Design a protein around this ligand. Structure first.
Ligand code: ADP
Ligand code: ADP
Ligand code: MG
Lengths: 246, 65, 269, 290
């Protein structure tokens, strides 16, 4: 092994062309990573099954997006770079949504970046900062708009160099979403009064313009972010539709 | 077999610390900052801070190595 | 609480003779190791003590201007870590310039002063310093015998101030005793009394010294309000005052020549 | 020094191995690449700094904390099982004496912890380990914080309503609510308030115990993450626990008071009538084992 990259909640990551080896003491991740062949996603090369431990082989990217913005907090990421990153992520998400698969865990820590300037999805199988109001309000339906909401949150964090909704708890997260995007009225979001975790005594916060929510973005970028940041899951812009966005 | 209560005995090696309940009548709490409604909602009182300060001030005063 | 903690059980010594014995033993161990590995460049224990106090002053200065807002309990814990580390170890084996930074980092982590490595190193070659602190953190933790809790006398000082404001009506305004006693505390910081006496005793003698300087006697406080033993506590306070009085700061030329000699030893080995 | 004997488990924070007196070595994980410049993990440091100052038979003890490079390994005593397995085991019967003994051990540990001004903050049935001699000990001190000087919270199933409403400053009330929830789980063999989210947890709490007014919780709107609720009548306590006595009902009512200041503490609870009644708590040797 070249070195030990680290270890998450499951498995140990090693570095060893340079590849990454994940050691697991499962089948769902292998099945989810074997059915798509896309250049904007981490590809599982080989699987080694041993009575000691299971080994998964992936391509090696030096760092992730979270460390990238941590190091570039003062330098500032130029607009073409973040635009290209967002478009690559949207292409990957559209390819994923073409198949019957859901990520639901889109955070900048889970996105990996290479030296050439390509960002690929990872971890196809605490995270309150990138949760959709549908999931927060106790809706069991897992649509494809949650990935778009998380991608919009990541995009806003990248452009503003700061998390859009840095809440600490689920209730505080929902409150921050309500302050930043107004109150989810029935006319704005049909069926909002039907989820188990909706209370009529919620504060009636008012909507504010995105000019103060995401200042440095352009009009087209603000419109795309607003379309991705929609209370109604049915009205959220799909990844395929987001790909064909000026 | 019945469990009989018995308070724990730990040597503070210092002057006797007044009881937490009595801190109201003895007048200690008049020499600190009044607790906010916010931390009073969660169960945090200035009596606890005064008791901790008094306990630490009298902790290990009559002790030698 | 202090009366059932490891600091009282292990890091409080009877007299300065034990401290001198431990420092001399550390210097002798380093000299024996160096002579076994295979002489004028060596430093006597008094030179080591002078350099340790100079670097403790340097750590005080560093924590004074540290950003963001740096509490005083964390600074006290860092200084106590420095003293505990260099009581049993020689100054030339590990350079104090990075050891004080490691102690500050460990104190910030332990005392719940949430700060990250970039913020810690921005207060200062920063990458090399970060690597050195990361390498030395485990060594510092092991040298402290995994006793990373330290009770500073500031909380007992505040408790004594509250009790004096409540139960002592002879003295009118306790605030006049806030400054001078605190100053005395700072002097006790430089002296080795942190490893000899309990924090409550330190706060008490600081308060009584401040009152004596102000001209107000407090024998009634000790005798009656504290139920007081009396002669023993008074002797402890007198020894504290003597320890503060006999302390002196090192001169500039001695510090410079000792620093040059230490750099020579560190570059030689 | 410590030969590894078996593998116990692996969590998000650390991995535990049973090693040889048989002990448990918990090795913290290096974490992600964004947590590589932080040296030793703050959870292990917190466990070390808080477990080296406490010595009680009902608190987990740090035998050793040897480490190498940036990896640190904590040595704890070996525990056969925990209280969660006892709750979820259908083969055994939880008599009132067993519940009394478990509550007594938990409350004695909590009293000793609160005397030294430490809040466990992570009280759960799986966090109350049981050794081979049937002695309950609190564990998982990675969230424990010292209180008394002017967002790491337990799971929603045992989170106190003050914590659910976002209380930054709190006393021993949160641990008291957690041990009350543990008592309810012991009695009913089921999660008393198994909410699906924070809002769902609050809804379940207010449906099972009734939404309190300002006369029972004097400070409500002061908390920042506070939401108003309907006036649910609340199921009577004796209806929920049909097999519980009147003294046990009073203890439960005190443990579940919506006012943290008025909520009974460990000292008040330990001297209550329920623990002094008949029969006495079960000795540790006779406690059930799966
Ligand atoms: N193929 C890879 N290339 C580069 N880095 C990787 C790769 N796979 C995993 N990593 C690194 O390993 C760390 C842990 O990843 P992961 O196992 O997905 O975390 P978790 O499973 O706990 O969410 C991440 O910080 C990531 O940077
Ligand atoms: N003293 C101990 N003896 C044996 N096993 C222990 C001990 N303390 C903890 N464990 C193990 O730790 C595991 C629980 O870890 P957990 O609390 O889920 O980690 P995290 O807090 O990171 O989620 C259990 O499976 C248990 O076997
Ligand atoms: Mg646990």
């Amino acid at each position: 092994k070249v070195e030990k990259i680290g270890e998450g909640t499951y498995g140990v990551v090693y570095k060893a062309e340079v590849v990454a080896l994940k050691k697991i003491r499962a089948i769902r991740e292998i099945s989810l990573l074997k059915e798509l062949n896309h250049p904007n996603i981490v590809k599982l090369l080989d699987v080694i099954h041993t009575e000691n431990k299971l080994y998964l082989v992936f391509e090696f990217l030096h760092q992730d997006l979270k460390k990238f913005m941590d190091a570039s907090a003062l330098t500032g990421i130029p607009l073409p770079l973040i635009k290209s990153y967002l478009f690559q992520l949207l292409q990957g998400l559209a390819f994923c949504h073409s198949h019957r698969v859901l990520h639901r865990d889109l955070k900048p820590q889970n996105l990996l970046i290479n030296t050439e300037g390509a960002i690929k999805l990872a971890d196809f199988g605490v995270t309150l900062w990138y949760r959709a109001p549908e999931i927060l309000l106790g809706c069991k339906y897992y649509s494809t708009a949650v990935d778009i909401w998380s991608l919009g949150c990541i995009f806003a964090e990248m452009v503003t160099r700061r998390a859009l909704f840095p809440g600490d708890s689920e209730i505080d997260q929902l409150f921050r979403i309500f302050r930043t995007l107004g109150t989810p009225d029935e006319v704005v979001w049909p069926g909002v009064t039907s989820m188990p975790d909706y209370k009529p005594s919620f504060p009636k916060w008012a909507r504010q313009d995105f000019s103060k929510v995401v200042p440095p973005l352009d009009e087209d970028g603000r419109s795309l972010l607003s379309q991705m940041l929609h209370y109604d899951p049915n009205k959220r812009i799909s990844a395929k539709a987001a790909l064909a966005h000026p | 077999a019945l469990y009989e209560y018995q308070p724990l005995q730990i040597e503070t090696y210092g002057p006797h610390v007044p009881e937490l309940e009595m801190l109201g009548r003895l007048g200690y709490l008049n020499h600190v900052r009044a607790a906010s409604p916010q931390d009073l909602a969660g169960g945090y009182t200035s009596s606890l801070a005064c008791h901790r300060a008094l306990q630490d001030a009298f902790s290990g005063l009559f002790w030698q190595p | 609480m202090y009366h059932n903690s490891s600091q009282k059980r292990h890091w409080t010594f009877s007299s300065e003779e034990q401290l001198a014995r431990l420092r001399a033993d550390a210097n002798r161990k380093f000299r024996c190791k160096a002579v076994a590995n295979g002489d004028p460049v060596f430093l006597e224990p008094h030179e080591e003590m002078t350099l340790c106090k100079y670097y403790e002053k340097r750590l005080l200065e560093f924590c004074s201007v540290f950003k963001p807002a740096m509490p005083r309990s964390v600074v006290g814990t860092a200084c106590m870590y420095f003293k505990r580390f260099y009581l049993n170890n020689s100054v030339m084996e590990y350079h104090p310039r990075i050891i004080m930074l490691t102690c500050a980092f460990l104190a910030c982590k332990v005392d719940e002063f949430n700060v990250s490595s970039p913020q810690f190193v921005g207060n200062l070659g920063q990458e090399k310093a970060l690597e050195q602190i990361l390498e030395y953190e485990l060594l510092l933790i092991q040298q402290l015998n995994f006793h990373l809790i330290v009770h500073n006398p500031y909380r007992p000082f505040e408790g004594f101030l509250i009790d004096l404001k409540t139960r002592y009506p002879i003295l009118e305004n306790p605030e006049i005793l806030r400054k001078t006693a605190d100053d005395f505390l700072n002097r006790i910081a430089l002296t080795d009394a942190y490893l000899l006496y309990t924090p409550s005793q330190i706060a008490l003698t600081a308060i009584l010294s401040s009152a004596s300087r102000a001209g107000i006697t407090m024998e009634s406080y000790l005798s009656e309000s504290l139920m007081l033993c009396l002669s023993q506590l008074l002797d402890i306070m007198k020894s504290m005052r003597n320890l503060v009085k006999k302390y002196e700061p090192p001169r500039s030329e001695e510090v410079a020549v000792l620093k040059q000699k230490l750099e020579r030893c560190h570059s030689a080995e | 020094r410590y030969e590894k004997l078996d593998f116990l488990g692996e969590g998000q924070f650390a991995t535990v191995y049973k090693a040889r007196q048989i002990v448990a070595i918990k090795k913290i994980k290096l974490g992600h690449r964004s947590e590589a410049k932080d040296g030793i993990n703050r959870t292990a440091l917190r466990e070390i700094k808080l477990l080296q100052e406490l010595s009680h038979p009902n608190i987990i003890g740090l035998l050793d904390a040897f480490g190498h490079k940036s990896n640190i390994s904590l040595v704890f005593d070996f525990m056969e099982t925990d209280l969660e397995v006892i709750i979820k085991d259908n083969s055994l019967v939880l008599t009132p004496s067993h519940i009394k003994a478990y509550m007594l051990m938990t409350l004695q540990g909590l009293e000793y912890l609160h005397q030294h001004w430490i809040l466990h903050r992570d009280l759960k049935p799986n966090n109350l380990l049981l050794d081979e001699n049937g002695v309950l000990k609190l564990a998982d001190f990675g969230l424990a914080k010292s209180f008394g000087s002017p967002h790491q919270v337990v799971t929603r199933w045992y989170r106190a309503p003050e914590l659910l409403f976002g209380a930054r400053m709190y006393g021993v009330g949160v641990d008291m609510w957690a041990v009350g929830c543990i008592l309810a789980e012991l009695l009913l063999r089921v999660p008393f308030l198994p909410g699906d989210s924070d809002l769902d947890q609050l809804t379940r709490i207010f449906e099972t115990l009734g939404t309190p007014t300002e006369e029972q919780w004097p400070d409500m709107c002061s908390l920042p993450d506070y939401v108003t609720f309907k006036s649910f009548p609340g199921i009577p306590l004796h209806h929920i626990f049909s097999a519980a006595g009147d003294d046990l009902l009073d203890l439960i009512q005190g443990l579940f008071l919506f006012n943290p200041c008025a909520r009974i503490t460990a000292t008040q609870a330990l001297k209550m009538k329920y623990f002094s009644n008949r029969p006495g708590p079960t000795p540790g040797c006779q406690l059930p084992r799966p």
